[PDB]
Amino acid sequence: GVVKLELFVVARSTGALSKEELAKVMLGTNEEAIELGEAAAARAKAMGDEESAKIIKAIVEKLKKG
Amino acid sequence: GVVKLELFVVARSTGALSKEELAKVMLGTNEEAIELGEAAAARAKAMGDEESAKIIKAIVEKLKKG
Amino acid sequence: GVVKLELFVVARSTGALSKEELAKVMLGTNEEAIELGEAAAARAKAMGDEESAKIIKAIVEKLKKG
Numbered sequence: 764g765v766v767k768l769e770l771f772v773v774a775r776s777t778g779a780l781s782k783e784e785l786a787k788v789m790l791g792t793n794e795e796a797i798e799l800g801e802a803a804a805a806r807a808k809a810m811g812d813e814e815s816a817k818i819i820k821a822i823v824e825k826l827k828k829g
Numbered sequence: 830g831v832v833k834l835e836l837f838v839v840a841r842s843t844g845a846l847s848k849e850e851l852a853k854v855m856l857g858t859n860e861e862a863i864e865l866g867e868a869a870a871a872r873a874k875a876m877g878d879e880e881s882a883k884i885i886k887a888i889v890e891k892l893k894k895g
Numbered sequence: 896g897v898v899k900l901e902l903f904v905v906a907r908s909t910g911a912l913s914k915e916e917l918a919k920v921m922l923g924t925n926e927e928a929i930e931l932g933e934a935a936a937a938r939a940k941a942m943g944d945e946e947s948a949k950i951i952k953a954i955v956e957k958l959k960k961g
């Protein structure tokens with residue numbers, strides 16, 4: 764709900780996920796959300812955006828055991 | 830509404846609603862939000878963006894059932 | 896907190912806060928959310944963005960009244 768949308772907002776503003784991947788984060792399962800979040804954080808690292816990586820990982824942490 | 834915010838997020842990132850219309854989605858009635866979402870989906874369709882149209886329509890459907 | 900993410904989305908759309916500040920708005924307490932939202936509204940007003948400014952103001956008020 765709110766946590767998947769947090770992930771969505773941060774990942775979209777980072778430009779780290781494609782349209783399909785964002786669609787899956789919004790309409791898919793929680794496991795898919797966790798996996799795309801991990802990919803998003805790694806991509807945020809790769810762009811030099813350490814802050815976004817830290818935010819995405821904290822959100823994924825909330826998303827995980829849930 | 831978390832779903833109204835989903836509509837807000839997707840429509841803003843796609844450019845499917847104008848600034849005023851996004852404001853209306855947040856501060857307007859539920860019917861106004863649904864109708865602006867449908868307009869956003871129709872505009873995305875008109876531009877050929879089927880992906881955005883499919884997501885917007887799913888969100889609007891959730892808005893209707895609530 | 897649907898309202899905290901609502902505040903986050905609107906404050907991010909203005910470009911008034913840095914990535915760190917947005918991180919605090921999303922992952923911090925409600926008090927930090929109120930203070931950074933007020934900062935975002937003040938900066939947006941200063942940049943000429945009325946609509947964003949007291950949309951944020953209404954949001955911060957909702958956040959404060961629990």
Ligand code: NA
Nearest residue numbers: 874875877879
């Ligand atoms: Na079409």
